[PDB]
Nucleic acid binder design. Structure first.
Ligand SMILES: O=C1COc2ccc(N3C[C@H](CCNC[C@H]4Cc5cccc(Cl)c5C4)OC3=O)nc2N1
Ligand SMILES: [Cl-]
Ligand SMILES: [Cl-]
Ligand SMILES: [Cl-]
Ligand SMILES: [Mn+2]
Ligand SMILES: [Mn+2]
Ligand SMILES: [Mn+2]
Lengths: 670, 671
DNA sequence: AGCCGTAGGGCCCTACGGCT
DNA sequence: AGCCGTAGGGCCCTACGGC
């Protein structure tokens, strides 16, 4: 909805395009309303390079810009009717605002190309460090970005019409592989030429989606939003032994500290982590309505509560023992983990699916006993083959159970990273009395919506697209579990109906495996052994660093305790020394001198409470020291022999297998 | 919408009504889907005692119920066509769920009475402690509420049709005064008869809105949502000196801790406190788009940042010195203040508007300097008249400045608590060249939406209801301020046009004063002096309790200093005593009997660190003891003489006036 | 009239890749 | 063709009282 300017001389009038009304309100308050109109849009606009033509012309946003510009489109473009001589793209200073700019330019170039050639399209430059313009105060948006006296608008120029053509089709067109080859050749881990602006802005968007949004890290199997939710729960001590915490608090916590994005993305990613039909090993324990297999969303975040599951403690275990590198957060006010310790193989256990740019990923979940057995075998034989690994890891193990048809799709996916896996419901034919039968479905394929699949069966029966079905009911319940009943007409073959259902409904569904994950911060198609080799290497690194951290801290503490033991052994001299010093600093110097102490030891002596001089407190000091010396010698044994450290890796993985390993759910049928 | 059950036999089928899809999901997952259908609604349902039939019949929620029930309505009702023989009202277990229940009952009583008389209407009893059914797990909603083996449904009974009629008309009808009377007459601060159910659930709703939602407390000027926000900022140290904090963290924090309601009510309440066109003395310091006078909303909470203003530190000043009573929060997991110390008279300074039940409140804002001089005059003269307080407090002072026409409406509002005050835009007539003129408006009345005012004027011009306006523009800008231009046709009398605009548009707007506030937890219409009296009596209690807290605290400390003095004087024997003690208890027991020490004194000695034995601490400890003793008598002098306590209140008020007092913005012109 | 301000409640558009 | 899941972006109904 346009906020027009009062002047009607197009030569001096500017229209700014902003992402929405949050951004529009700061822009309206700061503008010069005589000459500066504002059109807030609605986020991502239609990609006209990919869209059917009738659909573009019906698009509400497309239509409001055409109307606003007054020019018309395509053949009917009349540049003499433009209502503004500066069209100013002013999206947010983040990667999504870069994307929206590339979509806006695609539309101008494909439908209002003379606007560009006439020098009418500009790119505003609002400062970085604000999530959107709505975060800026009006006078700041004026002085930095909109005031003609200070701003630095870039004018879009079209130099090479053929290169611009090709550019728009490669970046914005539907041939993914040309977009993908552009990203790989260019990935890096005033006036403005449109080709160049399109390239740099789309690459800026595409790389961010690839390494910091849609794909999981090979080491902990997490995407950034999930890693930040799980770190946020741990920062707040939201452990299984504590009471549930309001989901609104959690989301608001994670958004402000670590994840500068919309609340629905954070909340709905936390939700998936609590759903036992989505996560093979759920990472979040939800209290309340957390959605169903029928596609119902969760309850609004003001109602639900959450904490960590017990297995999530294994993801976070030893995160504060210098086991993983922390990084600066998005605004330099917080620290966050680049990766979680991940003391079970979470990428394969829970799987992943993510639509990135130029590529996607689709990793099925696995049984945790089999995975760790697989890692165990790899650790005892670096040259193990994929086939040997499949003796441990039979194939996927979906939270929703069901059946897998055959093994060659599994084997291809594990050997190459790509493969097609036919999944089936668990369905039986059974008698219902009076000579009649029914088909009874008790498990359905992974990621299939049950209500949607039932409606698809009702549509087929209604439209006479399948014969033999008299009735269709969902009898699922907490007491029953999943139970879908399809009653068969008397004397009709119910095996033929079922096989037809497998052909015409999601009762059979394929899972296309496409195992892409971040390896060393780069997207990579990996096979099964590589995924396990990267995980095992992470675990050797974590436990080595935890050992190195534990040894430093123990030695420091022992060093302190040696000072307290000296003080307990010479308590009268300690008192005399301190009492005869004017100041704490003279005391600290004199203690260092008399008793050969370090500064840290002297300050520990000065900080000791008189209660530490009682009998049982002196014994406590001696006991902690003796215990610490034994602990130090054990830690040093581990760092001195790579084999002992590798054996500690296997032992802690075996402990996790025994505590959290469960039975396989999906049956793999020959 | 409707998740129907599979049985088509009505006598065994039940339909549960819940507030929405969040509640519906838990209900749908817990139900027995053979006999239990579910219809989520959309929150507050239409009050059909107040609405006419055309609106009712086209309301989406009402239609869905009628279709689902199958019986038709009114004279078309047919009990034989009921698709269920149990209609179960299962709203959330909170006062707004009680309200929705009264609304649904009203609809059944007025359109489907034979359903009640057949005993087909029931009330479910989900357990308390959940914000909505969407917080329960599926299985616990089944076992507590839906399972026929353990549930306690209430069958709605109609026992006297004359009493029911009158009850529905009184509680839900148009006339407000009968509703207000029922609340006043009744407020206290497995089958169910419908009149009892309607009176109980409605009174619960009404009392909760009256005393814990829409009306300000007379002492600190705040409604519960605003108090909890501001307390929330203070408990997280979001002070003016610290950086801004993310609005979403604040809102999520306040909702979990103290305010179990929608995030839109929390965020919008914080937003208004940050608007210098809404608050005469803004309590929240906002970062980003916090809305405008055109009725633009604030940026969404994921974009904005907030902290306290400096004047808000005065609302919170002394909150940690036992000056106000803390209470348990909604779930018993937290403590929250019942009232803030409010070291400036914030009820009148910032005003309030609120719609409650059976009553509303409209308090206009005032100039801080005038208010405090008012309170000061009062404190010197309990018998002071309203005319004399108006020598200090001339009338409201809107953040939007503007003009007030005359004093008679102000005077009536201050004497009785009610009165109409005419607000006028600041408007001049000026030349624009070529012999033509214009009207220029630079200030609009309080709470008038500028863009809406402009389009009303434009509407009068295009509908030829006002002569002589040729053009109209909004030239407002950050550099210019508010500036609306109205061009006048050449030769037209721009003063006639102006006067017509005051008549026909919000350019002139009334403020209807209705000073209702909470006095001792009860709503009360109060005049200006009573409002000032209650505030001053608050300031006396706060300063007296603060003084008593510092006295208690200073005496505990001097006591500790006396025990440490003794230790430092016998430090060798203190150390030995301790060293030969196996446990801290034996040490405690020994120190007390040897040096005549209390438990806390001997605990302080055992807690003392070694660095405290340096040779100037004894004098440093003696130094603090003798100032503390000077400090204890200063405090005791205040508590011994009420005139001194009163003078201390005046002194701290005068200093607040000097630091935050500012000039009057609204001009009162005579009438 | 419809607006003030705390409350109850929810829906739909867009991009992106790969499988059907 | 339209589904999967992280992302960008917003709008409407209801109660309540006084004018
Ligand atoms: O308690 C907390 C904690 O952390 C938070 C972070 C962030 C946000 N939020 C919420 C809000 C966006 C969600 N509602 C948008 C409405 C627009 C619209 C239009 C038509 C139909 C519908 Cl249904 C809707 C829904 O914007 C924002 O930033 N809230 C919270 N709350
Ligand atoms: Cl300590
Ligand atoms: Cl304090
Ligand atoms: Cl208005
Ligand atoms: Mn944005
Ligand atoms: Mn509710
Ligand atoms: Mn008027």
């Amino acid at each position: 909805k346009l906020a027009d300017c009062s002047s009607k001389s197009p030569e001096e009038c500017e229209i700014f395009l902003v992402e929405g009304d949050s951004a529009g309100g700061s822009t309206k308050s700061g503008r010069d309303s005589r000459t500066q109109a504002i059109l807030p849009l609605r986020g991502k606009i239609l990609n006209v390079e990919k869209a059917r033509l009738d659909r573009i012309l019906n698009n509400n946003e497309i239509r409001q810009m055409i109307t606003a510009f007054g020019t018309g489109i395509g053949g009917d473009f009349d540049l003499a009717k433009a209502r503004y001589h500066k069209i100013v793209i002013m999206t947010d200073a983040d990667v999504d605002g870069a994307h929206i700019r590339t979509l806006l330019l695609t539309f101008f170039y494909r439908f209002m190309r003379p606007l560009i050639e006439a020098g009418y399209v500009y790119i505003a430059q609002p400062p970085t460090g604000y999530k959107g313009l709505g975060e800026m105060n009006a006078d700041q948006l004026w002085e930095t970005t909109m005031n003609p006296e200070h701003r630095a608008l870039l004018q879009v120029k079209l130099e090479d019409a053929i290169e611009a053509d090709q550019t728009f089709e490669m970046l914005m067109g539907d041939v993914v592989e040309n977009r993908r080859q552009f990203i790989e050749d260019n990935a890096v881990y005033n006036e403005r030429n449109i080709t160049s602006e399109m390239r740099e802005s789309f690459l800026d968007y595409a790389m961010s989606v690839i390494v910091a949004r849609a794909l999981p890290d090979v080491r902990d199997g997490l995407k950034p939003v999930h890693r930040r939710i799980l770190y946020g729960l741990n920062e707040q001590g939201m452990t299984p032994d504590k009471s549930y915490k309001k989901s609104a608090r959690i989301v608001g916590d994670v958004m402000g500290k670590y994840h500068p994005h919309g609340d629905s993305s954070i909340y709905e990613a936390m939700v998936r982590m609590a759903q036992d039909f989505s996560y093979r090993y759920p990472l979040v324990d939800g209290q309340g309505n957390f959605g169903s297999m029928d596609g119902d969303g969760a309850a609004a975040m003001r109602f639900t509560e959450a904490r960590m599951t017990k297995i999530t403690l294994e993801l976070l275990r030893d995160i504060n023992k210098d086991t993983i590198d922390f990084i600066d957060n998005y605004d330099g006010n917080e620290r966050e983990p680049s990766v979680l310790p991940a003391r079970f193989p979470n990428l394969l256990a829970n799987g992943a699916s993510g639509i990135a740019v130029g590529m996607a990923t689709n990793i099925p979940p696995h049984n945790l006993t089999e995975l760790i057995n697989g890692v165990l075998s790899l650790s005892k034989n670096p040259d193990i083959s994929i086939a040997e690994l499949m003796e441990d890891i039979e194939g996927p193990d979906f939270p929703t159970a069901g059946l897998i048809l055959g093994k060659s799709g599994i084997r291809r996916a594990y050997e190459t990273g790509r493969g097609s896996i036919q999944m089936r419901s668990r369905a039986v034919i059974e008698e219902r009395g009076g000579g009649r039968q029914r088909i009874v479905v008790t498990e359905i394929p992974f990621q299939v919506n049950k209500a949607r699949m039932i409606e698809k069966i009702a549509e087929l029966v209604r439209d006479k697209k399948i014969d033999g079905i008299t009735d269709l009911r969902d009898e699922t319940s907490l007491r029953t579990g999943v139970r879908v009943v399809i009653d068969v007409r008397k004397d009709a073959n119910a095996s033929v109906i079922l096989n037809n259902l497998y052909k015409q409904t999601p009762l059979q569904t394929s899972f296309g495996v496409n195992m892409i994950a971040l390896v060393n911060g780069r997207p990579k198609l990996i096979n099964l052994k590589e995924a396990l080799v990267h995980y095992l290497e992470h675990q050797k690194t974590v436990v080595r660093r935890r050992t190195q951290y534990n040894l430093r801290k123990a030695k420091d503490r022992a060093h302190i305790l040696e000072g307290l033991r000296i003080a307990l052994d010479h308590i009268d001299e300690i008192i005399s020394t301190i009492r005869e010093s004017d100041t704490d600093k003279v005391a600290m110097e004199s203690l260092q001198q008399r008793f050969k102490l370090s500064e840290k030891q002297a300050q520990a002596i000065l900080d000791m409470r008189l209660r530490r001089l009682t009998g049982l407190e002196r014994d406590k000091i001696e006991a902690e020291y003796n215990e610490l010396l034994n602990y130090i010698s054990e830690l040093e044994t581990i760092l001195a022999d790579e084999e002992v450290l590798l054996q500690l890796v296997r032992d802690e993985l075996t402990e996790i297998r025994d505590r959290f390993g469960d039975d396989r759910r999906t049956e793999i049928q020959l």
